Amino acid sequence: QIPQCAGCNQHILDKFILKVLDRHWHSSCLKCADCQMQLADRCFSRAGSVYCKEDFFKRFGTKCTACQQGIPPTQVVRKAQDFVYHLHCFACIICNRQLATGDEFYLMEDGRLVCKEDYETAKGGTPLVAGSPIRHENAVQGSAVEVQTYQPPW
């Protein structure tokens, strides 16, 4: 079937169709709102627009999953799946212990963190091992830009 472009909402007739999550794009519509460069690599989406990494970061900050405060661009962060935290907010909600690199924990669906010991006692969460602190740059990844073609049978 012929998808409509998430950008311009027209049917995409190009042989190569771009896919960002489960939305389809014209390659000529998947351009940074700011600098107009084609997004070959990663797409950074916010509200009604899409950006390159540089122009996304120049413009937007990241909220901590836990405290909902801004994380300064000049500070490292912790990550569990897609969630981003201040180091001091990367802590068990039950015992309040700050998790260190390598610590075993469980991530609840909404981003709440539970140390292994407290989770298993209380017991669902996803089991994880705490990653090293990451630079604010490499924290938000954006979405991969995938490629598909029209192929028979149609």
State the residues that interact with Zn ion by CB under 5 A: 5, 7-8, 26, 29, 32, 34-35, 52, 55, 64, 66-67, 86, 89, 92, 94-95, 115, 118
Q: What is the largest CA-CA distance in the chain?
A: 58
Residues in the chain that come right before a backbone break, where C and next N are over 2.5 Å apart: 123
Cβ distance to Zn ion smaller for residue 55 or 83:
55
Would you say 32 or 140 has its CB closer to Zn ion? 32
**Cβ 152 to Zn ion shortest distance, Å:** 24
- When the beta carbons of 41 and 144 are compared against Zn ion, the nearer one is 41
Burial 40-78 (b: 16+ CB within 10 A, else e): eebbbeeeeebbbbebbbeeeebebbbeeeebeeeeebb
Q: How far is the CB of 139 from Zn ion (least distance, A)?
A: 13
- Which residue number, 122 or 144, has a Cβ lying nearer to Zn ion? 122
**83 near 111, Cβ under 8 Å?**
yes
Structure tokens at 76: 């490292």
CA–CA distance, 82 with 99 (Å, rounded to integer): 17
Minimum CB separation from Zn ion for residue 1, in Å?
16
The verdict on whether omega for the bond into residue 72 sits within 30 degrees of 0, i.e. cis, is no
CB nearer to Zn ion: give 35 or 109: 35
| Least distance to Zn ion, CB of residue 151, Å | 21
- Minimum distance from residue 2 beta carbon to Zn ion (Å): 12
